[PDB]
Design a protein around this ligand. Structure first.
Ligand SMILES: Nc1ncnc2c1ncn2[C@@H]1O[C@H](COP(=O)(O)OP(=O)(O)NP(=O)(O)O)[C@@H](O)[C@H]1O
Ligand SMILES: Nc1ncnc2c1ncn2[C@@H]1O[C@H](COP(=O)(O)OP(=O)(O)NP(=O)(O)O)[C@@H](O)[C@H]1O
Ligand SMILES: Nc1ncnc2c1ncn2[C@@H]1O[C@H](COP(=O)(O)OP(=O)(O)NP(=O)(O)O)[C@@H](O)[C@H]1O
Ligand SMILES: [Mg+2]
Ligand SMILES: [Mg+2]
Ligand SMILES: [Mg+2]
Lengths: 469, 486, 53, 484, 121
């Protein structure tokens, strides 16, 4: 005989269930309600006292009535794990949503697990090449580390996510998880299609990638939890299969946002800018799970929304802590036509050390930054008074930096519909040598526009002549 | 007294009425009060129910009766609404009798999942040269129209709804695009005048007007776009197409902030409730192109957002930008300079348009989108003067010519076939000679000429949708032919 | 002669400078006004929260 | 009987309302029936507020909570060295039990007005820029402050590394034992930092207290406090510790979480009403004890992180007020190549030239005030005009000192290395040398001095001062290496 | 201060009082007002800032028995003289010595502002 009770309160996502027995379901437990069409999952978040528990719903709570029967499942929300998920689109509560029936899995893990201990940690300093000049040169990604893609609305987070899944995820020869958190359903649908066409999912064959979705149409509870589901399937390959997993999450911001939507109704006094007081531990309890143990590795790239173009908004502000590599997409840049809109100074990598990348590699990027900071340090002198009021040194380092800034913009394979240009994938060794040459003054006479939207150094000259006659 | 189906008012104020009883009532179930005023039960607590009123506080006394409805907040949906003007709940206000109800749908519904959707390919033809060329919209796409106060935002929505008359006078349901226009917080007189203008173009007959105006209860304003979505959806779930215009979502948000704050929910950024992003998300997700298996019916949304001082980095603007499939952004600067529509090409994008665009347009529009943003940048460094260039001075002529060409009188939505000839004359450069004060003339002069002379092309563009090299060189000739005579 | 031409160059350069500067002012006057408001809002939310109890 | 035990009234978000526990003390540890621990922070007429030290899936209503009789405390002593521990002193490096010489409390008083001695002994960082311009003494509190990724841990890390010079020697009063406190950091960083220290063989004299990102707030709240206690043992027994709070911003965030969830009414920026006392009581524990107390010392290097360089903000201001001085770090300077990104104008060590080796103070007189008059002239040349006898001199000079104070990471320098370089720069033997070449001058002038003028370097090291004769030889050697 | 008031009223001498730092007086009240659960005033200060200061400062006065002259260090938070704390301090003074960072960073000590520093006399 299972453990059952009665709904006593419903306010938005929040459901108050009272039990009439001695045993009360543990925090994090899944509880069920049989609905007219399906089943509503609730998750225990707190024990209120007097035998009532407060829960967050996983789906809309219209139609619920007080007194209604509620079943305790006996454990936390569980999802299918193992190779059984690859090729399949999975819901937040572990259900298939690709109309291909059941997922007969070997096991079903709970989405809430404790993150790997400190002595369970295993560290390294390996560059993950991307074929993307900006990242490779100035702020390179960590193999088996966490990577963040910061941007306001429409500066190109998701496109940048795609190019990476396109560059690294096929080539990878590991397994990958894509978890769409509080983003467009249209995009999940688009992704699904593109995977099928790239062979990364073979419906009537085998596949490299499981998909989990909790899109922006889904209620707060779903958008809060779906990130951990995709994470759970990710961990299972790392620990049991000892594999190197790639976890792509667009958008990780939507997770905190979701938490804020319920936080009031959980009776928490609001924090700075109306966020949950639990914002930083909530983020840790997820992020600390995404990491490289001794048993296997996880490399994750996550798009991060930035409300009202505010990098000091609590949500993305708190994230910077968890990231080995950050690439930050500036609206200002994207509005000058420079795609990707990576801020060449504001973007940071743990791996930009001379003894991980080579002193030769280190020196180039350093001086690029020096140059770009000097052009930045003059921006306003120019904007007001023009080039005419600058000392001849300055005037030169501006002519060079203007080329450098366009040289970091690159045609993306996945952005072909917007560029109108074929996509290039420059090599890390190529990127360094190219920019070293430009620093050495070898291409001062060349038109600036020849640097716009190209591959490596040879493409500049190749296009420079196209601009000749 | 039947505390299971009935309630008693405990208190009322701030648009909320707390009610004892109503035991079996559902969450978000509609209610009817003694006065007649309806309400919605939003908070189900042990001992009482929090209920948000769809009318004036005045019409609820303590003690009064509260009748259950047995219904989640819903609308009358279906084709019997075409041509009518309704408030937020479905009740008619154009005085034209009861609504011919095909049936009823919930105000709040989940947007269709990942699978039952199909990528957009069918063009939504606006009739606006600037839109249909540079930011083309597709059936199922959601396109934000964003800008400052009085920038021709509604104008762009209105010309689109008029333009649909073309396809709405024929048998083809697949070609027809029924229209839903949502008036949230506007002046009552404005809507009156707007509905009248639809009637003066025989467009009312294929469109539904949802209106919760400026004096109406905030919950009626927050609700309107959601019930409207349901009305739009009936055409979607029935293999037909529909366009829903949300005018505007700013005022909706402000109303939903009013609702939230008076409910005691924590003020966040700009004192907006936490779930204001989700407020718009779940609405705007409801517009999608359905799959082959699901009858291929579509809902195509155009939400309107009003920015202050042209700040697109504001909270609600960026929010809605993060939902929609792109934004047509109108500069006040260009609008005040007489360039209407005032589409900023730099800050405007259709994210799925190049695949929805009429294949013939795409071909003649070659890098015009990318060109104009380059020209307007060149014309910025054109501050001198004592340094008059010979090189890019020709793109400065093209620019001013193409700028002139895209300008459009309001209520002049041209057919897609009347568009490509004009754009062909611009892009390729058969306009670099013609004076800037006679391009509007060149337009009417060149349409009449083609309509009489080369009608065979204008009919082939309309029916092929493409341009064969034989029809491209045919257009070419007729262009230089008309150039020699002006 | 050189003197005269310079006067015209300074007339023209300052014609451009004070027009750019004017353009900056308009932009920043929007940014000031937003920050003006979010600073009033935030202080008030902070105060209002301080009596949530 | 509810004196020693209480049942659980309600539990949510790392907070538990317990009924009973009548004879419990304010800030006493508790065990829950499930094994999780907690801290009684609120005692009211009907109930007790308890912050949990672990997962609240493990607490339920009706469960039995138990007194410990114990105010929060930690294992302390020289046994901790080399180990890594959590906020409560439990071992987390998976190397087994700790050797506790005792158990200090979490919250100890600071030493009062009496048991104290003026700060006079140098804590050497090896960073040419710090030890010349912002010299950190024994018993000092020196704030490292700046934006994310501006070299905050980098500055404190290079100090820990450097102390190796004395920590390998027998001399027990020249040594400096290290405690690194990581509050709010992800575990992959702490692990990667302990490894860096192991590489440089600096873990042996180092204790790592950590309260990482995933941990319950009270554990991040408590971590700098119990780490103090750990470090205080050294101070209390004639030895000298150096504690690093990386960073205090994250601690403050943890404390705000506790309090908001305990429903204690918030203050400015949703922070607790005494988020100054939090820091002020912590940072007063870093002292220099009197002779009557063994002359031991706790030196603190708290870290604070600013959002967009806003030193005007609540917490950064609070802590600026507590400490004896600050090292400001700026991306603007960092990305211009200047490393460490030390804002020479704002940065001060109020303990000053009293906390600095004699042989350094002498060559580094008015080097900070000069670098201050250098930017003053650099803004005069911002509206570029003609350069005279005065301006063209100090601009060319100051460009080379700024350059000379650039320093590679993981590379501290001995004081006998810093002293010639600064004399070389300040007295004016660098001015006719190409600005771009000072790098090679550093490595080259040192290799040169190690062969010939080895007399100078071991003299400077041992006597720590400079005679009129020693400086005369330093005058020669530098001129003697000017034409290559 | 209570130790001072005795010498003024009993010994009837001109007493000197040196307070450092007066700012902390205010800052601490702010903390206790917070903790007593008052609704914080602007910049999060105690709603009794002015009268709490008044109470203290009005005692530091010249009576017809003796004198209390007091020199006080006033910490000005984030170099900002409009902060409610030092703002509330000014009113109580007879003379003021303003120390300016712009003076001290050029290398001028004492870092006094020869215009901001005012006096009755
Ligand atoms: N790498 C790129 N190259 C060229 N154009 C781009 C690139 N990235 C973005 N764009 C343009 O800018 C838009 C960015 O869209 P997207 O890549 O979805 O960014 P986003 O930040 O995820 N938007 P949102 O999620 O709504 O905040 C696209 O529609 C393109 O027009
Ligand atoms: N293409 C056009 N040519 C001439 N006039 C136009 C055009 N488009 C709009 N207008 C007029 O310009 C005014 C502003 O356009 P409108 O359609 O009201 O945009 P709006 O942004 O909705 N203004 P508001 O509703 O007050 O925020 C109206 O009087 C229009 O009739
Ligand atoms: N003197 C130096 N020369 C060259 N690189 C340096 C120097 N100092 C620091 N870096 C690098 O710059 C990066 C940032 O330094 P770090 O010590 O992390 O500062 P931080 O403020 O602690 N950053 P975070 O803690 O992540 O906010 C690190 O990767 C360092 O290796
Ligand atoms: Mg996106
Ligand atoms: Mg309008
Ligand atoms: Mg650090």
């Amino acid at each position: 005989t299972p453990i059952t009770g009665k709904v006593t309160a419903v306010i938005g996502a929040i459901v108050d269930v009272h039990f009439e027995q001695s045993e009360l379901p543990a925090i994090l437990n899944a509880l069920e309600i049989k609905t007219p069409q399906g089943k509503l999952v609730l998750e225990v978040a707190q024990h209120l006292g007097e035998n009532t528990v407060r829960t967050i719903a996983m789906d809309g709570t219209e139609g619920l009535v007080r007194g209604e029967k509620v079943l305790d499942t006996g454990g936390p929300i569980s999802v299918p794990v193992g190779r059984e998920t690859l090729g399949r689109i999975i819901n937040v509560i572990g259900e298939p949503i690709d109309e291909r029936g059941p997922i007969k899995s070997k096991l079903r893990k709970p989405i809430h697990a404790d993150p790997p201990s400190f002595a369970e940690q295993s560290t390294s300093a390996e560059i993950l090449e991307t074929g993307i000049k900006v990242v490779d040169l100035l702020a390179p990604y960590a193999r088996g580390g966490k990577i963040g893609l910061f941007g306001g609305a429409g500066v190109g987070k998701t496109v940048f996510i795609q190019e990476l899944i396109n560059n690294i995820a096929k080539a990878h020869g590991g397994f990958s998880v894509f978890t769409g958190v509080g983003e467009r359903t249209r995009e999940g649908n688009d992704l699904y299609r593109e995977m099928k066409e790239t062979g990364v999912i073979n419906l009537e064959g085998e596949s490299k990638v499981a998909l989990v979705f909790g899109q922006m149409n889904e209620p707060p509870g779903a958008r809060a939890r779906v990130a951990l589901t995709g994470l759970t399937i990710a961990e299972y390959f790392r620990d049991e299969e000892g594999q190197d997993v790639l976890l792509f999450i667009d958008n990780i911001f939507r997770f905190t946002q979701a938490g804020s939507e319920v936080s009031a109704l959980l009776g928490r006094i609001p924090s700075a800018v109306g966020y949950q007081p639990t914002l930083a531990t909530d983020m840790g309890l997820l992020q600390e799970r995404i990491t490289t143990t001794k048993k296997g590795s996880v490399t994750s790239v996550q798009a991060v929304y930035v409300p009202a173009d505010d990098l000091t908004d609590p949500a993305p502000a708190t994230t910077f802590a968890h990231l080995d590599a950050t690439t930050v997409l500036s609206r200002g840049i994207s509005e000058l036509g420079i795609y990707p809109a990576v801020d060449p100074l504001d973007s940071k990598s743990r791996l930009l050390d001379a003894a991980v990348v080579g002193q030769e590699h280190y020196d180039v990027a350093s001086k690029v930054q020096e140059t770009l900071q000097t052009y930045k340090s003059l921006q306003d002198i120019i904007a007001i008074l023009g080039m005419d009021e600058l000392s001849e040194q300055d005037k030169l380092t501006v002519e060079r930096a203007r080329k450098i800034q366009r040289f970091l913009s690159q045609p993306f394979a996945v952005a072909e519909v917007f560029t109108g240009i074929p996509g290039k994938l420059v090599r890390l060794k190529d990127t360094v040598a190219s920019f070293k040459a430009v620093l050495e003054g070898k291409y001062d006479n060349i038109p600036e526009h020849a640097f716009y939207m190209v591959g490596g150094i040879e493409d500049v000259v190749a296009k420079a002549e196209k601009l000749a006659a | 007294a039947n505390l299971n189906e009935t309630g008693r008012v405990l208190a009322v104020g701030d648009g909320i009425a707390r009610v004892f009883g109503l035991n079996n009532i559902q969450a978000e179930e509609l209610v009817e009060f003694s006065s007649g005023v309806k309400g919605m039960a939003l908070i189900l607590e042990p001992g009482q129910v929090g209920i948000v009123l769809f009318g004036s506080d005045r019409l609820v006394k303590e003690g009064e009766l509260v009748k259950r409805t047995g219904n989640i907040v819903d609308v009358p949906v279906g084709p019997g609404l075409l041509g009518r003007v309704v408030d937020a709940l479905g009740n008619p206000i154009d005085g034209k009798g009861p609504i011919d109800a095909a049936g009823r749908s919930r105000a709040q519904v989940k947007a269709p999942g990942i699978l039952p959707r199909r990528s957009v390919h069918e063009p939504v033809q606006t009739g606006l040269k600037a839109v249909d060329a540079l930011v083309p919209i597709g059936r199922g796409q959601r396109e934000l129209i964003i800008g400052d106060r009085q920038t021709g935002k509604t104008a762009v929505a209105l010309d689109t709804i008029l333009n649909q008359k073309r396809w709405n006078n024929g048998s083809d349901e697949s070609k027809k695009l029924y229209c839903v226009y949502v008036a949230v917080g506007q002046k009552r007189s404005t809507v009156a005048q707007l509905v009248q203008t639809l009637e003066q173009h025989d467009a009312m007959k294929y469109s539904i007007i949802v209106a919760a105006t400026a004096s109406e209860a905030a919950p009626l304003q927050y609700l309107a776009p959601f019930t409207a979505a349901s009305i739009g959806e009936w055409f979607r779930d029935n293999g037909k197409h529909a366009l829903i215009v949300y005018d505007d979502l700013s005022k909706q948000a402000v109303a939903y902030r009013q609702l939230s704050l008076l409910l005691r929910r924590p003020p966040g950024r700009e004192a907006y409730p936490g779930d204001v992003f989700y407020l718009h998300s779940r609405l705007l997700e409801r517009a999608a192109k359905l799959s082959e298996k699901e009858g291929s019916g579509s809902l195509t949304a155009l939400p309107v957002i009003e920015t202050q001082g042209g700040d697109v980095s504001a909270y609600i603007p960026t929010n809605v930008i993060s939902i929609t499939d792109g934004q047509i952004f109108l500069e006040a600067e260009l609008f005040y300079k007489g360039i209407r529509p005032a589409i900023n090409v730099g800050l405007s994008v259709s994210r799925v348009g190049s695949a929805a665009q009429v294949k013939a347009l795409k071909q003649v529009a070659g890098s015009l989108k990318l060109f104009l943003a380059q020209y307007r940048e060149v014309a910025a460094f054109a501050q001198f003067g004592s340094d008059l260039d010979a090189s890019t001075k020709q793109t400065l002529v093209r620019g001013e010519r193409l700028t002139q060409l895209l300008k459009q009188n309001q209520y002049s939505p041209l057919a897609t076939e009347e568009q490509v000839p004009l754009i062909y004359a611009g892009v390729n450069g058969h306009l670099d000679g013609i004076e800037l004060s006679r391009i509007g003339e060149f337009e009417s002069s060149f349409l009449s000429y083609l309509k009489s002379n080369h009608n065979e092309l204008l009919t082939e563009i309309r029916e092929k949708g493409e341009l064969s090299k034989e029809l491209l060189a045919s257009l070419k000739s007729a262009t230089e032919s008309f150039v020699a005579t002006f | 002669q050189g003197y005269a031409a310079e006067i015209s160059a300074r007339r023209n350069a300052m014609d451009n400078a004070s027009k750019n500067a004017g353009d900056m002012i308009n932009r920043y006057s929007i940014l000031y006004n937003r920050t003006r408001q979010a600073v009033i809002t935030n202080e008030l939310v902070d105060i209002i929260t301080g009596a949530s109890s």
